[PDB]
């Protein structure tokens, strides 16, 4: 299939070269896979989700997204127009308040929640979780993400936006999860993207158009934007049977476009996620 005039990041993860505007993808489009978005929530009523989204857990007085951050991330995974896996089922988990902040204890509670809740859902093709959040290093936070991965959920985490080595941030620094940096439309490491040996892969992160609250759209930038590109890709590749939740990050990294990025410091992978579709 082909989506003309798509957001540049969708075109890029289906291109061996930059400067294209069409999104080429298999029509299965992640059907039968489930992606948990752990963030400020999801405005499920948005027309772009087509009823495939719902809020399953909150740790605050409200389960609505009052901030917009989570709705945008969910849009990049699975919105009808802006999403990688246009037929996936999305489940929201509000671990951050509408200011965008949260406590590490509530972050941990949300990861252990998904490890249990997935057993109450029909995800015959696999389960992914997207974590476009982070903070300072904490073993406990890392341990929570590692537990989630081991249970059989592909965990993708944003590397961070401090133009520093991600080893001093959590859960980015956890070796067992997939740690995603950001690139821009000219195949450069985004200026703000963290780096380091703990990074697994890069995805589109600068000026990413996606869903927002109030039934709207907007473009924003960060490693938070690259992570759902990778989260959706994993859901798409599992439906196709190409990999498993356990071995997906390694599979994306091996099949990636290798050697196309600039502004990559020595000691960081030069891998840009690629969906390897050949119509």
């Amino acid at each position: 299939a082909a989506q003309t005039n798509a957001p540049w990041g969708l075109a890029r993860i289906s291109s061996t070269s930059p400067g294209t505007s069409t999104y080429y993808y298999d029509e299965s489009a992640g059907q039968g896979s489930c992606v948990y978005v752990i963030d400020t929530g999801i405005e499920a009523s948005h027309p772009e989700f087509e009823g495939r989204a719902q809020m399953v857990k909150t740790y605050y007085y409200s389960s609505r997204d009052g901030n917009g951050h989570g709705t945008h991330c969910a849009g990049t995974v699975g919105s009808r127009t802006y999403g990688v896996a246009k037929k996936t089922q999305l489940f929201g988990v509000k671990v951050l308040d509408d200011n965008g902040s949260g406590q590490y204890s509530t972050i941990i509670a949300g990861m252990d929640f998904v490890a249990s809740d997935k057993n109450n859902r029909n995800c015959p093709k696999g389960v992914v979780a997207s974590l476009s959040l982070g903070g300072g290093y904490s073993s406990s936070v890392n341990s929570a993400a590692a537990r989630l991965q081991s249970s059989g959920v592909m965990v993708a985490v944003a590397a961070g936006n401090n133009n520093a080595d991600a080893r001093n941030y959590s859960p980015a620094s956890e070796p067992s999860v997939c740690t995603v940096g950001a690139s821009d439309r000219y195949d450069r490491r985004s200026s703000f993207s963290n780096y380091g040996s703990v990074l697994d892969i890069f995805g589109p992160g600068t000026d990413i158009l996606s869903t927002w609250i109030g039934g709207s759209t907007r473009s924003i930038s960060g490693t938070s934007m690259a992570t759902p590109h990778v989260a959706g890709l994993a859901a798409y590749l599992m439906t196709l049977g190409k990999t498993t939740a356990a071995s997906a990050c390694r599979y994306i990294a091996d099949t990636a476009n290798k050697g196309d990025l600039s502004n990559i410091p020595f000691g960081t992978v030069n891998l840009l996620a690629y969906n390897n579709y050949q119509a």
Partner: peptide, 6 residues
């Protein structure tokens, strides 16, 4: 004790 959006 706090994490943030990125």
């Amino acid at each position: 004790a706090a994490a943030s959006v990125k």
